[PDB]
Design an enzyme around this catalytic site. Structure first.
Site, mmCIF file in Angstrom:
data_model
loop_
_atom_site.group_PDB
_atom_site.id
_atom_site.type_symbol
_atom_site.label_atom_id
_atom_site.label_comp_id
_atom_site.label_asym_id
_atom_site.label_seq_id
_atom_site.Cartn_x
_atom_site.Cartn_y
_atom_site.Cartn_z
ATOM 1 C CB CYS A 109 -0.982 0.022 1.168
ATOM 2 S SG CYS A 109 -2.009 1.477 1.170
ATOM 3 N NE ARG B 29 2.258 0.681 3.742
ATOM 4 C CZ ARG B 29 3.412 0.025 3.799
ATOM 5 N NH1 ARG B 29 3.746 -0.647 4.890
ATOM 6 N NH2 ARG B 29 4.195 -0.009 2.725
ATOM 7 C CD1 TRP C 232 -7.125 8.867 -2.252
ATOM 8 C CD2 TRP C 232 -8.076 9.119 -0.253
ATOM 9 N NE1 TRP C 232 -6.199 9.448 -1.424
ATOM 10 C CE2 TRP C 232 -6.763 9.616 -0.188
ATOM 11 C CE3 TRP C 232 -8.874 9.170 0.888
ATOM 12 C CZ2 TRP C 232 -6.228 10.162 0.976
ATOM 13 C CZ3 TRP C 232 -8.341 9.711 2.050
ATOM 14 C CH2 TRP C 232 -7.032 10.201 2.084
ATOM 15 C CD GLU D 243 -5.070 0.330 -9.431
ATOM 16 O OE1 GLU D 243 -5.629 -0.714 -9.859
ATOM 17 O OE2 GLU D 243 -3.860 0.364 -9.072
HETATM 18 C C1 HEM Z 1 -6.548 6.374 1.547
HETATM 19 C C2 HEM Z 1 -5.985 6.102 0.311
HETATM 20 C C3 HEM Z 1 -5.305 4.936 -0.132
HETATM 21 C C4 HEM Z 1 -4.530 4.900 -1.240
HETATM 22 C C5 HEM Z 1 -4.063 6.090 -2.080
HETATM 23 C C6 HEM Z 1 -4.145 3.569 -1.439
HETATM 24 C C7 HEM Z 1 -3.480 3.174 -2.569
HETATM 25 C C8 HEM Z 1 -3.165 1.866 -2.827
HETATM 26 C C9 HEM Z 1 -2.533 1.390 -4.062
HETATM 27 C C10 HEM Z 1 -2.087 2.230 -5.225
HETATM 28 C C11 HEM Z 1 -2.422 0.041 -3.976
HETATM 29 C C12 HEM Z 1 -2.020 -0.913 -5.047
HETATM 30 C C13 HEM Z 1 -3.328 -1.224 -5.734
HETATM 31 C C14 HEM Z 1 -3.181 -2.206 -6.878
HETATM 32 O O1 HEM Z 1 -2.268 -2.039 -7.724
HETATM 33 O O2 HEM Z 1 -3.993 -3.151 -6.940
HETATM 34 C C15 HEM Z 1 -2.968 -0.293 -2.653
HETATM 35 C C16 HEM Z 1 -2.924 -1.537 -2.134
HETATM 36 C C17 HEM Z 1 -3.320 -1.952 -0.921
HETATM 37 N N1 HEM Z 1 -3.853 -1.159 -0.005
HETATM 38 FE FE1 HEM Z 1 -3.939 0.830 -0.001
HETATM 39 N N2 HEM Z 1 -4.609 2.742 -0.453
HETATM 40 C C18 HEM Z 1 -5.349 3.535 0.361
HETATM 41 C C19 HEM Z 1 -6.057 3.056 1.469
HETATM 42 C C20 HEM Z 1 -6.067 1.773 1.953
HETATM 43 C C21 HEM Z 1 -6.770 1.322 3.183
HETATM 44 C C22 HEM Z 1 -7.719 2.188 3.984
HETATM 45 C C23 HEM Z 1 -6.425 -0.001 3.375
HETATM 46 C C24 HEM Z 1 -6.864 -0.945 4.262
HETATM 47 C C25 HEM Z 1 -7.448 -0.708 5.491
HETATM 48 C C26 HEM Z 1 -5.532 -0.318 2.289
HETATM 49 C C27 HEM Z 1 -4.984 -1.556 2.116
HETATM 50 C C28 HEM Z 1 -4.196 -1.972 1.033
HETATM 51 C C29 HEM Z 1 -3.815 -3.374 0.742
HETATM 52 C C30 HEM Z 1 -4.032 -4.633 1.555
HETATM 53 C C31 HEM Z 1 -3.285 -3.328 -0.483
HETATM 54 C C32 HEM Z 1 -2.844 -4.506 -1.271
HETATM 55 C C33 HEM Z 1 -3.952 -5.017 -2.153
HETATM 56 C C34 HEM Z 1 -3.497 -6.200 -2.978
HETATM 57 O O3 HEM Z 1 -2.558 -6.907 -2.530
HETATM 58 O O4 HEM Z 1 -4.064 -6.425 -4.072
HETATM 59 N N3 HEM Z 1 -5.343 0.746 1.430
HETATM 60 N N4 HEM Z 1 -3.429 0.795 -1.983
HETATM 61 O O1 LIG Z 2 -8.680 0.719 -0.349
HETATM 62 N N1 LIG Z 2 -7.743 -0.031 -1.000
HETATM 63 O O2 LIG Z 2 -7.425 -1.242 -0.471
HETATM 64 C C1 LIG Z 2 -7.187 0.426 -2.160
HETATM 65 C C2 LIG Z 2 -6.585 -0.470 -3.076
HETATM 66 C C3 LIG Z 2 -6.042 0.016 -4.277
HETATM 67 C C4 LIG Z 2 -6.105 1.405 -4.562
HETATM 68 C C5 LIG Z 2 -5.663 2.182 -5.664
HETATM 69 N N2 LIG Z 2 -5.968 3.498 -5.447
HETATM 70 N N3 LIG Z 2 -6.568 3.486 -4.238
HETATM 71 C C6 LIG Z 2 -6.707 2.288 -3.623
HETATM 72 C C7 LIG Z 2 -7.244 1.812 -2.430
#
Ligand code: HEM
Ligand SMILES: O=[N+]([O-])c1ccc2cn[nH]c2c1
Ligand code: HEM
Ligand SMILES: C[C@H](O)[C@H](O)[C@@H]1CNc2nc(N)[nH]c(=O)c2N1
Ligand SMILES: C[C@H](O)[C@H](O)[C@@H]1CNc2nc(N)[nH]c(=O)c2N1
Ligand SMILES: O=[N+]([O-])c1ccc2cn[nH]c2c1
Lengths: 413, 413
Positions: A110, A113, A282, A287
């Site tokens: 992520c 974070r 968000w 993406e």
């Molecule tokens: C608030 C804005 C957030 C942004 C900008 C963000 C952005 C991202 C991005 C760019 C990825 C990679 C997505 C992909 O290529 O499939 C990702 C993955 C991930 N995010 Fe965050 N995220 C956010 C919030 C969260 C929250 C609130 C959680 C969980 C409570 C979270 C959990 C994760 C996890 C577990 C992954 C890995 C997903 C996977 O392995 O396919 N994200 N996020």
């Molecule tokens: O909430 N999420 O786990 C999550 C996963 C992927 C993306 C990409 N932009 N934002 C994200 C949020």
């Protein structure tokens, strides 16, 4: 003692002492078994459960500044006792919250974070029917969407007990376009959801054969059978793609949903497992603009946007792909901004991650990170993250991937 | 039995059976100890040397279609015998050639490996003085450059024997710009070579305080001391940066050398080590346009090219960085093409690597690859390589990194 980590851009060095608290060359593997926590048809053996339980309880109580010793020792006792009497135990609401943010905080893939501490937690551990599950999910979607001003949130459903009573969302993400085949051989919509789309049909869903048809929530509760529910259209907010200079962009008739909510991950905390706990943040422009819109296994619009830009789409060396994708990204960003829907570009994203990472090391001497995932699909080395060295390690709490539920499921009828 | 590897783009699967022939989570580490083969001050213990020697000899003879059994068994004998009498052994010219191409073939970080079989080998194992070393290096540069039509080549210097008699080029690459500090605090030229530039000065080099001053060859022979030699200007061919649309581009006064020759790597084959064996291929646009020209720890010209393009260089969300870097890449490519100097864009590069990779698996059930390195610094997911899963493993022969020679060197005077 620890591990030196260099940031080849600022030259600065860091000492990772946190990797020592991990668990147990597979470079670019997407779903490695090391990151998956699968099914089980027997409870979680007391000798395993008890130690993890204590660790977690010691983590929780060891987190606040004004440490309340009494409550701590007390909780520890009440906990072990509950374990001795019932087997598995129940986390306090405050603990579950702490558990959900840490798990996020401990998410190697992520980029967003820095927000870890700012999360909304929906306690749906009382849930017991798909119909009730569907209602909570709607409350989630409605909360998170917030008329464009997206809010991060997670809805926690009942923890795994024996194993045959698992709660599971069969979808990959909450909102997600459908992908249908076609008479003329061409694929329509999101080609990645071809499999799951078919499944929804098998479960009696009405396929409105379109490009952006929001798939149905396929819910499974208490080890039951999967029931299908269509997401109320009034709940699915979408942005219409529009370029700030090319008036022919809207003629592409593109659009995307504003809510990025991961649906199928398992939350592991104190030895307890939560097979269903969707969460959402968000979007980050790339993406949608790069993955969703450009990948040859998705909407694949790159060549289409190419010729309309008037480029030598037949001379690779012209870098038309580089120019085109960038304009698409401009569209995605411009559109979310114009229609007042939260979104963040990848450059800004990276700078904030770098900031985040510093805090993590200063605060706890480490920060799990998957470089392969953390670096943007476009303009890699232009972002600071590309130059940062980083260690990837599974801590705890943690959000694991799960085996696709349809593969392993004792079907009722 | 083996390992399944999926290509998330074409969906195709592969079986890696080759990883079994490897040696012995560190994700984004640049110079891991696992990839370095350092100094030693005692010969290579006979029990270690003999087995590796045989393996290699069995590899060599096991490579041709019409297998010559006699010669094989015969060589094996002659080899072990030479080992019993002298200790270390000498490879046939044909073997050394085979050794240099395999090592390339087995290079996890090289994108241009489809060319593996097309390499020129310069046998400089007879060399014995820095002056002779310098002469061979010039022959190399002159051959490789070939008036713009770049040719891949490698010059092999005498193999490590006891350890105190190592041949070593102190430079990172053959041709490489100098980086000087400045009275007004600003850095000038290639900021990455600041350290080595100083060293050259200490060794009595005349610093022509410029932006593109080609550094001096710092050669060390037979464990001797490092002697400095300036590369004959007539030998260093350079391309002048020029944009095909922006006439103000040449006003930037940029240019880069056409020869990408890695100088400081050790070749390991049959248990023998070659501390000095520079090699060269030809450039891939992004290397110059993105790394060299844009990195904040190099020439860092991104903001400069930004404003001259008339962009909101103060609003990150505008994607000005994305637009600018791309135009720089266009310049680099346009210029190498116009001035008839071999060069390949990254997109084309990737497609050729994918082709390469197939051949590798069909031909030998594997192909070592470092995704982190193999994926272009810009437009990642736009190239096929981003979507290919891949295993990274150190086979043999192999080109290892070495400990920086100035750090460990018994100085004479
Ligand atoms: C608030 C804005 C957030 C942004 C900008 C963000 C952005 C991202 C991005 C760019 C990825 C990679 C997505 C992909 O290529 O499939 C990702 C993955 C991930 N995010 Fe965050 N995220 C956010 C919030 C969260 C929250 C609130 C959680 C969980 C409570 C979270 C959990 C994760 C996890 C577990 C992954 C890995 C997903 C996977 O392995 O396919 N994200 N996020
Ligand atoms: O909430 N999420 O786990 C999550 C996963 C992927 C993306 C990409 N932009 N934002 C994200 C949020
Ligand atoms: C013919 C054209 C070639 C192309 C397009 C090519 C391209 C590349 C690229 C893009 C890299 C990464 C460079 C970096 O980021 O520092 C690289 C690395 C490498 N290449 Fe190739 N290469 C070519 C030929 C060769 C040859 C002839 C050899 C050796 C005999 C070779 C050996 C390697 C090695 C060892 C690395 C890793 C260098 C390091 O670890 O810093 N390359 N090459
Ligand atoms: C930290 C990270 O590994 C490092 O900055 C990288 C990544 N991948 C790379 N890829 C290439 N081609 N060249 C490099 O120097 C690097 N360095
Ligand atoms: C094979 C490779 O690991 C895979 O195609 C990647 C790489 N890194 C990624 N990075 C992100 N953000 N999302 C992804 O799906 C992937 N997939
Ligand atoms: O010859 N090489 O080892 C080599 C190393 C890096 C690059 C980048 N473009 N071309 C290259 C050739």
């Amino acid at each position: 003692q620890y591990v030196r980590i260099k940031n080849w851009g600022s030259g600065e060095i860091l000492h990772d002492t946190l990797h020592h608290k991990a668990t147990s060359c597979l470079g670019s593997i997407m779903n490695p078994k090391s990151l998956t926590r699968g099914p089980r048809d027997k409870p979680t053996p007391l000798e395993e459960l008890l130690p993890h339980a204590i660790e977690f309880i010691n983590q929780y109580y060891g987190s606040f500044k004004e440490a309340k010793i009494e409550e701590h020792l007390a909780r520890l006792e009440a906990v072990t006792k509950e374990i001795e009497t019932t087997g598995t135990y129940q986390l306090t609401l405050d603990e579950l919250i702490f558990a959900t943010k840490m798990a996020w905080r401990n998410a190697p893939r992520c980029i967003g974070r820095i927000q870890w501490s700012n999360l909304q937690v929906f306690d749906a551990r009382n849930c017991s029917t798909a119909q009730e599950m569907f209602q909570h999910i709607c409350r989630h979607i409605l909360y998170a969407t917030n008329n464009g001003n997206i809010r991060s949130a997670i809805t926690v459903f009942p923890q795994r007990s024996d194993g045959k009573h698992d709660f599971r969302l069969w979808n990959s993400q909450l909102i997600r376009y459908a992908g249908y085949q076609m008479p003329d051989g061409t694929i329509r919509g999101d080609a990645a959801t071809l499999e799951f789309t078919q499944l929804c049909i098998d479960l009696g869903w009405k396929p409105r054969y379109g490009r952006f048809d929001v798939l149905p929530l396929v819910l499974q509760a208490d080890g039951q059978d999967p029931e299908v529910f269509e997401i109320p259209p009034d709940l699915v907010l979408e942005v219409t793609m529009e370029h700030p200079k090319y008036e022919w962009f809207q003629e592409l008739g593109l659009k995307w949903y504003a809510l990025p909510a991961v649906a199928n991950m398992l939350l592991e905390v104190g030895g307890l497992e939560f097979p269903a706990c969707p969460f959402n943040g968000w979007y980050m422009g790339t993406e949608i603009g790069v993955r969703d819109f450009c990948d040859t296994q998705r909407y694949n619009i790159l060549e289409e946007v190419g010729r309309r830009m008037g480029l030598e789409t037949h001379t690779l060396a012209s870098l038309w792909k580089d120019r085109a994708v960038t304009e698409i990204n401009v569209a995605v960003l411009h559109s979310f901004q114009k229609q007042n829907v939260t979104i963040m570009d990848h450059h800004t994203a990276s700078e904030s991650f770098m900031k985040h990472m510093q805090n993590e090391y200063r605060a706890r001497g480490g920060c799990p990170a998957d470089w392969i995932w953390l670096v943007p699909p476009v303009s890699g080395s232009i972002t600071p993250v590309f130059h940062q060295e980083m260690l990837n390690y599974v801590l705890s709490p943690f959000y694991y991937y799960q085996i696709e539920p349809w593969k392993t499921h004792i079907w009722q009828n």
